[PDB]
Design a binder for this molecule. Structure first.
Ligand SMILES: CCCCN1CCC(N(Cc2ccccc2)C(=O)Nc2ccc(Cl)c(Cl)c2)CC1
Length: 360
């Protein structure tokens, strides 16, 4: 599995292609269906136990990973997955003849499609597949663009189609350059690894957003930003990838869709909990009260019916558990607080708040 065994290949390859099209995650995370995954869509286990997932990962990588891997380790897992996808293509009577006929770059494009939509999806493209086998590249490209595939992921699909049309990596070289040049507009001139405050302000100005708006925090959430103070190059590239954007105009068009996600099950809670770590000083375990108040006012205004009294109470540090539980309190509390359970192991801060707020 050593990547050195692949040094004779091009530096552009199927892993790099899928890193651009589907994204790379170096820490264990839950996918859509809630399953522990890592790398480029590598499912670790269906077990609810993170410890189980870590055991599988330590097993596959051959070291104590603690749930974090390097890009090279992710490529090793991915290459195993490619090998299995290829084996399947080669048993598929519809896909084998096409695959066999293609050059290496165009084979990568076909494998990309199989990763996205499975063999049955890809096999359904009967005319386009025949065109590819006959080297009718421009016709194949025209037909593929009329599909539901194209409508679902137009930017990815356009790159894959261009790869069929040309047999070159140009669409991926162009994407990388576009993202690099966009990133360079925002990067800290003294630290190329991040965008600092001046760059975040420029980013917000380019998106026509007030930095203090909830939209900006929603963006941070979608980019999984570690801290309000900076926006790393990795975060920027991973988020633009996951959102399928290569331009500010495309990102701007995506913001309303991010905002809509907050209505899906559990997503507001995920956003709310995200806010705590994002807002806090990294060197600290807890969140300074003044900063907690600022973010509570941003995210809970119009949701927490006692927010104004909460402010008054506090104006007379916050740990993660207390932050988290305020949302639960907000959700369960009656309009008159008459259903508060003092034995519910709420934070002392909330017990004290209820005692303060009832006389008001
Ligand atoms: C409740 C009132 C909060 C007020 N401030 C707190 C700092 C916020 N901040 C840093 C920042 C951005 C632009 C201009 C000046 C400072 C950030 O939000 N960073 C940030 C960091 C990373 C990303 Cl991806 C994004 Cl979108 C934003 C913006 C809102």
């Amino acid at each position: 599995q050593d990547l050195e065994n692949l040094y004779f290949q091009g530096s552009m390859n199927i892993f790099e292609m899928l890193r651009i099209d589907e994204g790379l995650r170096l820490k264990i995370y839950k996918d859509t269906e809630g399953y522990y995954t890592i790398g480029i869509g590598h499912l670790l286990t269906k077990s609810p136990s993170l410890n189980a997932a870590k055991s599988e990962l330590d097993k596959a990588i051959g070291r104590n990973t603690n749930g974090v891997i390097t890009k090279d380790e992710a490529e090793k897992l991915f290459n195993q997955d490619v090998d299995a996808a290829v084996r399947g293509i080669l048993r598929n009577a519809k896909l084998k003849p096409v695959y066999d006929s293609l050059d290496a770059v165009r084979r990568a494009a076909l494998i990309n499609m199989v990763f996205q939509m499975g063999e049955t999806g890809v096999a359904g493209f009967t005319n386009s597949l025949r065109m590819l086998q006959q080297k009718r590249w421009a016709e194949a490209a025209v037909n593929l663009a009329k599909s539901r595939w194209y409508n679902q992921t137009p930017n990815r699909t356009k790159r894959v189609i261009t790869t069929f049309a040309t047999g070159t990596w140009d669409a991926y070289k162009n994407l990388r350059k576009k993202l690099e040049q966009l990133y360079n507009r925002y990067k800290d001139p003294q630290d190329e690894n991040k965008i600092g405050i001046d760059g975040i302000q420029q980013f917000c100005d380019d998106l026509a957003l007030d930095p203090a708006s909830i939209s900006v925090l929603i963006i941070a959430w979608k980019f999984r930003a570690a801290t309000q103070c900076e926006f790393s190059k990795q975060e920027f590239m991973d988020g633009m990838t996951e959102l399928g954007c290569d331009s500010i105009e495309k990102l701007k068009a995506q913001i309303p869709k991010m905002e809509q996600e907050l209505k899906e099950p559990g997503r507001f809670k995920d956003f709310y909990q995200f806010t705590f770590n994002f807002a806090k000083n990294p060197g600290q375990k807890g969140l300074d009260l003044e900063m907690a108040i600022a973010y509570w006012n941003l995210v809970l205004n119009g949701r927490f019916k006692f927010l104004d009294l909460w402010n008054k109470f506090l104006l007379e540090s916050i740990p993660k558990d207390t932050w988290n539980l305020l949302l639960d309190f907000s959700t369960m509390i009656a309009d008159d607080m008459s259903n508060y359970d003092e034995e519910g192991a709420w934070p002392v801060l909330i017990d004290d708040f209820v005692e303060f707020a009832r006389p008001q």
